Structure 1
C-alpha cells in the first residue's frame, strides 16, 4: 500500500485540477474573444 503522510494527497491533486480548470476556461474565453473578430 502507498504510504500515508501528514500532507493530504487528494487535496493536492484536487487543487491542481481546480487550477487546471481555471486556466482552461480563461484560455477559452480569450480564444472566443480572438476568433469572433
Structure 2
C-alpha cells in the first residue's frame, strides 16, 4: 500500500485540477474573444 503522510494527497491533486480548470476556461474565453473578430 502507498504510504500515508501528514500532507493530504487528494487535496493536492484536487487543487491542481481546479487550477487546471481555471487556466482552461480563461484560455477559452480569450480564444472566443480572438476568433469572433
TM beyond 0.5:
yes
Instruction: Note the residue ranges of structure 2 that are not aligned, 5 or more in a row.
Output: none
- In 1: Cα distance, 2:33 partner to 2:19 partner: 22
Q: TM-score, normalised by structure 1?
A: 1.00
RMSD over equivalenced CA pairs, Å: 0.0
Q: TM-score, normalised by structure 2?
A: 1.00
Q: What's 1:18 paired with?
A: 18
Question: How far 1:10 sits from its partner (Å)?
Answer: 0.0
- In 1: Cα distance, 2:6 partner to 2:25 partner: 32
Q: Which runs of 4+ in 1 moved over 3 A?
A: none
- In 1: Cα distance, 2:22 partner to 2:6 partner: 27
